[PDB]
RNA sequence: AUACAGUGAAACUGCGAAAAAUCAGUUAUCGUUUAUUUGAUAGUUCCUUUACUACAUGGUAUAACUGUGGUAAUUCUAGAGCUAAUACAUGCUUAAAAUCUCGACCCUUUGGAAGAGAUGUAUUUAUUAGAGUCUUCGGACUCUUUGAUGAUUCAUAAUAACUUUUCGAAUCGCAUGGCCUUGUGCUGGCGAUGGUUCAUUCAAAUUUCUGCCCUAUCAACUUUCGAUGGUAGGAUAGUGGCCUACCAUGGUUUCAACGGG
């Protein structure tokens, strides 16, 4: 496979083999072979239209097999710049794929590819890692300084992570999606992002009530971030459709969530809470109960 | 080359770091009880 | 390799070539330590020449305060122990009435530990209190009643502290350095200037009220019950003329 | 008058917050010099800057404590001290007289009189020739 | 280590804005220094609320020891610079809810603020400034009147 | 011994070759470096991870070597191809983490715990902290929370970021042991090197003051091209006109400054 990809790099019939490879690349040693095939393919018409979307996925993310390889991001950006003002955006995005001064300079398809390559090259680089903290803060600063950008960021989060049963009511991929939802809500399309985050938190709650510590920490961080998101937003229909099963499972447990119950009860919030109702149990069952009682009264 | 020796050495390095951290976080708790009894007297 | 004016309490022979050994970096200073060459070559005479001293150091026979320290120019200075495993020997090197490094033959149950004066108590990193001592054993987590110019009792199996002698007015004291070397007794007066030149004054059998610098003194224990043994009648320096008048 | 230069007179790492309020305008920093030298309230509540003050600046007094008398105040923010110590060399067989001169840094929190007795401390180098510091008259 | 000589110096860094370059320089005894040459970006921090951000520096408008450094746009310590004001404005809108002090709310809609350099990028390796606010803002508005 | 194994040319590497004028001392470094030795020192590098991953450990770029010559000599050389690492340059560290709180509840605690919460270092800033009773007569009942210095803006912790980046072991010789899930499965010792920070050590650096010949038919010297201070900066391991700007015009001296041997 590596020898054949080297021969294809050494290369009509090449375009027909590129159409067959476009089928195989729309479908899916494999890492080095994919690197060699991308370096060959970055140097049809409808196969080109599908490959532009596949290269946009590879320059927006490296999600499934790897996690945000910079060589993969460079090869995907070279393929996208070979596919498709444009020169200035290409130079800024090439310096970004090469990040500090580029983010300071870049602080509509160019904007789509810009959010793509920015969250690709800083797609959760690590937890701290002595530079990943600064990289995650830089990506959050660029996402807050660049409404279409935040809409596309929530769109990419939902594109990572059917939906009908997920709105009505894969453990390792669910843990990765829960970490993705925690990282997305870590920032300083609202209905679709809230629906996807509620579906991820509910699936994490189900798979945790059924790796277990990973699901526990991810569900705890996601529930605290969901309370923070509802407090920073402040629609009651989807709000009730999300809160119903969660507070029902947390009926006996409520004797994060208590701060959400005390922050969603202080006029219109009082109507939103009385739409559900429990509250006397939250009051009776300590400063953590004293603040809730002497505020909720 | 991965001989049996090198991964034994890596195993010993990892267990060395964990055991040093274990002894240090035992000594910290011991000093905490000592400061507790120094408070109590 | 600068020499022939050594610290002259080493008492090396002057017709022994030209030079004199350079103590390397270590737990003690230059002119108040004693390397193992000067120890095992012209202080107790177990080895004739310096390369034979290197042979007995390389063959793991000697350990200073717990571990081997295979090194000729190792400045094993004051108050430590030297546990020669062969000859069953525990050389504690302490001071004398005249200014030299007197030797002992310590029992094993006393050679199992050593002591030493602290130099500072600090907060090192991540809010961890650590003390130092005079021989560089910066050890963590003391009892925080440890004050400056005080002595701890290092366990020498681990580096822990077993006990400490919280010095104040009136607990038995040693001296080190200065022209009042090798004296004991702590109870006349306790002077405290601002910038040194102060002592806890001394009281002996002849009750000689003596002083020196506070850097030149450190503690041992309780009066009459010391933690370390002391050589040749627990050195006093009464008088040699009075000694030749009586005996 | 306080400001006398193109640059603002800064005492760094200590600054007020505008949203909080007090009648001090800056959390003004002061320190006791040591060796029994006591800071005066005129030096405390004087809003002078003095980045080289041995009560409120950056320098710390240590070691030598000399005496002297003022011989001149004809330099900008530095004063000159005389020391006419009694001197004797056995070639003379008499108590002969010399004099010793030195420049000493001075603070705006203290009056200066040509003739009075000043107690001077040793500090870090401050100028090409000024090494000492006034601490107390 | 650490000999002495009689009288000489060295060439300064006298850095500019545009085409940020950092050249390391050898220091005897650890802490290998970095001369910034023509650095175009810097770390700038609010004093009161306490938020830093890396920000494209616009230009130094005042120097208190040589007026020619403002002409050549030299970034030394303790100068008066304009930057961007937009990420601090973004944090202000985000976490105060005002969505806009008086003499800095008047500078927000003007666009660029004034700040003071505190690092020495001729020797250290980076540039930081804090946005002047309070009596520093008072005397530096008086220094703007000293400009005009 | 079908990777090598003790022996070792050569070479790469690592380390070391560093006439108050001189000085003899004295003082500080709360004004710098701190290599070597010695003692403590660090679980965090991928999780937009199930179309699941370099860590049972990934890459060049070359010596010695082989080959072609020059040349008048050799401690002179140019070309080419090989091949190594503690050289050079990257780089993930498997109950993805792991530990302490709160521990309600039980069952009796020396627990075991569902879930409410946090977690490196280094660099450069800006802060903040850093200062009278009840009495089983036995004891308890709440007590007034911080290290040192003569002295701190010290030590240190947290806070919000920036890191052209730091480190957080891709190394080596000896034995080969315990386990049972008999798999090249899990673990395991002695100690060589390297590295973060602090202390000690020596070594360097300035700086304090006490001290040397003959002199006034030697009394003025120095601001030029900073001579003397301030303020800010450049610099520098670092204070400091050591230099750069603006302000002030000083300083030394007849007690012999300055000069003469």
From Swiss-Prot, chain B:
Cleaved signal peptide residues: none
Localization (cell): Cytoplasm; Nucleus, Nucleolus
Cross-link Glycyl lysine isopeptide (Lys-Gly) (interchain with G-Cter in ubiquitin) residue location(s): 37
Similarity remark: Belongs to the eukaryotic ribosomal protein eS6 family.
Function: Component of the ribosome, a large ribonucleoprotein complex responsible for the synthesis of proteins in the cell. The small ribosomal subunit (SSU) binds messenger RNAs (mRNAs) and translates the encoded message by selecting cognate aminoacyl-transfer RNA (tRNA) molecules. The large subunit (LSU) contains the ribosomal catalytic site termed the peptidyl transferase center (PTC), which catalyzes the formation of peptide bonds, thereby polymerizing the amino acids delivered by tRNAs into a polypeptide chain.
Other observations noted: Present with 66000 molecules/cell in log phase SD medium. There are 2 genes for eS6 in yeast.
Complex and partners: Component of the small ribosomal subunit (SSU). Mature yeast ribosomes consist of a small (40S) and a large (60S) subunit. The 40S small subunit contains 1 molecule of ribosomal RNA (18S rRNA) and 33 different proteins (encoded by 57 genes). The large 60S subunit contains 3 rRNA molecules (25S, 5.8S and 5S rRNA) and 46 different proteins (encoded by 81 genes). Interacts with snoRNA U3. uS11 interacts with MPP10. Component of the ribosomal small subunit (SSU) processome composed of at least 40 protein subunits and snoRNA U3.
Swiss-Prot record, chain C:
Intracellular or extracellular location(s): Cytoplasm
Any Pfam family matching the protein: Ribosomal_S4e
Major site of localization recorded for this protein: cytoplasm
Location of cross-link Glycyl lysine isopeptide (Lys-Gly) (interchain with G-Cter in ubiquitin): 54, 126, 153, 160, 166, 171, 203, 225
Residues in S4 RNA-binding domain copies: 34-97
Positions where Phosphothreonine occurs in the chain: 107
GO molecular function: RNA binding; rRNA binding; structural constituent of ribosome
Gene Ontology CC entries for this record: 90S preribosome; cytoplasm; cytosol; cytosolic small ribosomal subunit
Keyword Kinase: no
GO biological process: cytoplasmic translation; translation
InterPro entries in alphabetical order: KOW (IPR005824), Rib_uL2_dom2 (IPR014722), Ribosomal_eS4 (IPR000876), Ribosomal_eS4_C (IPR032277), Ribosomal_eS4_central_region (IPR013845), Ribosomal_eS4_central_sf (IPR038237), Ribosomal_eS4_KOW (IPR041982), Ribosomal_eS4_N (IPR013843)
Modified residue annotations for Phosphoserine: 24, 239
CDD domains xref list: KOW_RPS4 (cd06087), S4 (cd00165)
Keywords: Cytoplasm, Isopeptide bond, Phosphoprotein, Ribonucleoprotein, Ribosomal protein, RNA-binding, rRNA-binding, Ubl conjugation
Quaternary data: Component of the small ribosomal subunit (SSU). Mature yeast ribosomes consist of a small (40S) and a large (60S) subunit. The 40S small subunit contains 1 molecule of ribosomal RNA (18S rRNA) and 33 different proteins (encoded by 57 genes). The large 60S subunit contains 3 rRNA molecules (25S, 5.8S and 5S rRNA) and 46 different proteins (encoded by 81 genes).
Family of the protein in this entry: Belongs to the eukaryotic ribosomal protein eS4 family.
Note: Present with 573 molecules/cell in log phase SD medium.
Protein name (database record): Small ribosomal subunit protein eS4A
Name of the gene: RPS4A
From Swiss-Prot, chain D:
GO biological process, alphabetically ordered: maturation of SSU-rRNA from tricistronic rRNA transcript (SSU-rRNA, 5.8S rRNA, LSU-rRNA); ribosomal small subunit assembly; translation
Cellular compartments per GO CC: 90S preribosome; cytosol; cytosolic small ribosomal subunit
Extra remark: There are 2 genes for uS17 in yeast.
A matching Pfam family: Ribosomal_S17
InterPro entries named among the record's database cross-references: NA-bd_OB-fold, Ribosomal_uS17, Ribosomal_uS17_arc/euk, Ribosomal_uS17_CS, Ribosomal_uS17_N
Localization, UniProt: Cytoplasm
Descriptive protein name: Small ribosomal subunit protein uS17A
Modification after translation: N-terminally acetylated by acetyltransferase NatA.
Cross-link (Glycyl lysine isopeptide (Lys-Gly) (interchain with G-Cter in ubiquitin)): 10, 41, 51-52, 74, 91, 100, 128, 136
Curated annotation (Swiss-Prot), chain E:
Entry's localization field: Cytoplasm
Pfam family, one: Ribosomal_S8e
Alphabetical list of InterPro entries matching this protein: Ribosomal_eS8, Ribosomal_eS8_CS, Ribosomal_protein_eS8_euk, Ribosomal_Se8/biogenesis_NSA2
Modification type Phosphothreonine: residues: 41, 86
Top-level lineage group: Eukaryota
Keywords: Cytoplasm, Phosphoprotein, Ribonucleoprotein, Ribosomal protein
GO BP terms in the entry: maturation of SSU-rRNA from tricistronic rRNA transcript (SSU-rRNA, 5.8S rRNA, LSU-rRNA); translation
Any one GO cellular component localisation term in the record: cytosolic small ribosomal subunit
Alphabetized GO MF terms: structural constituent of ribosome
Modified positions (Phosphoserine) in chain numbering: 45, 48, 52, 65, 102-103, 106, 109
Note: Present with 15900 molecules/cell in log phase SD medium. There are 2 genes for eS8 in yeast.
Function: Component of the ribosome, a large ribonucleoprotein complex responsible for the synthesis of proteins in the cell. The small ribosomal subunit (SSU) binds messenger RNAs (mRNAs) and translates the encoded message by selecting cognate aminoacyl-transfer RNA (tRNA) molecules. The large subunit (LSU) contains the ribosomal catalytic site termed the peptidyl transferase center (PTC), which catalyzes the formation of peptide bonds, thereby polymerizing the amino acids delivered by tRNAs into a polypeptide chain.
PANTHER family membership: 40S RIBOSOMAL PROTEIN S8 (PTHR10394)
Name used for this protein in its record: Small ribosomal subunit protein eS8A
Native source species: Saccharomyces cerevisiae (strain ATCC 204508 / S288c)
